[PDB]
């Protein structure tokens, strides 16, 4: 198995990062992709990915941080992207929340990063929150000249999922599926996701699985909880966990062009 969504740069891991990674590995997670959400965090992520075996990172600017996009940002992204730890441009995309960055600022930063990924022939690590129509409209002239893309932390409808996978987009499922109140629609479309488009993630330290037992007092999520998520997803899909683990691992290698041990 493989966690495509780990905010390992988070302050929540500052004291025990070596152990968090090692615990993830001891629990059978074969590799991590560390999220970059702005320029400095992307820089930290790449530094951390050097520190551990089977760790990679993304380089980019989250739509929340899109207001900081500048003329020098592109070159900085490319400088990072040139490094072998960096395997995707992102996290980038749209969130209909405009309080931290305007839709104008979001669209501009998003298109800019799609352009970089096309120039570098790299896949994109994407994010879409209540913005499917605008999102696909901007993606359209770029996605086909990209090696691939993932919609990480997918929270859309069944039709929206089907619209995305038609264009090759991988669907990233977190522990939110395990939320009884809030993850129902997600859980119900789950078996309809094509196996070869399915990717798995914790989004640690966030989205601690509600059906996880036992839970920490800190309520901090960690990649070591990935096997729980995979097992729940496999069950709801009516599949063997070992099989889906192999499938999703292949999806990661197909998408990011990386190699890691099974």
Residue numbers in the entry: 1 to 262
Show me the paper's own sentences about this structure.
TatD represents the first example of a TIM-barrel exonuclease that hydrolyzes the phosphodiester bond at the 3′ end of a nucleic acid chain.
To characterize the biochemical properties and examine the structural basis of TatD in DNA degradation, the full-length E. coli TatD with a C-terminal His-tag was expressed and purified by chromatographic methods using a Ni-NTA affinity column followed by a Q-Sepharose anion exchange column. TatD has a TIM-barrel fold, forming a barrel made of eight β-strands surrounding by nine α-helices. This acidic pocket is likely the metal-ion binding site and the basic surface on the side with several basic residues, including R98, R129 and R219, is likely involved in DNA binding. Since the E. coli TatD does not bear these two histidine residues, very likely it belongs to the Group I TatD that are activated by Mg2+ but not by Zn2+. Therefore, based on the structure comparison of the active site of TatD, E. coli TatD resembles more closely to the group I TatD and likely binds two or three Mg2+ ions in the active site for DNA hydrolysis. In summary, we suggest that the conserved acidic residues E91, E201 and D203 are responsible for binding of metal ions, and H62 for playing a critical catalytic role in the active site of E. coli TatD in DNA hydrolysis.
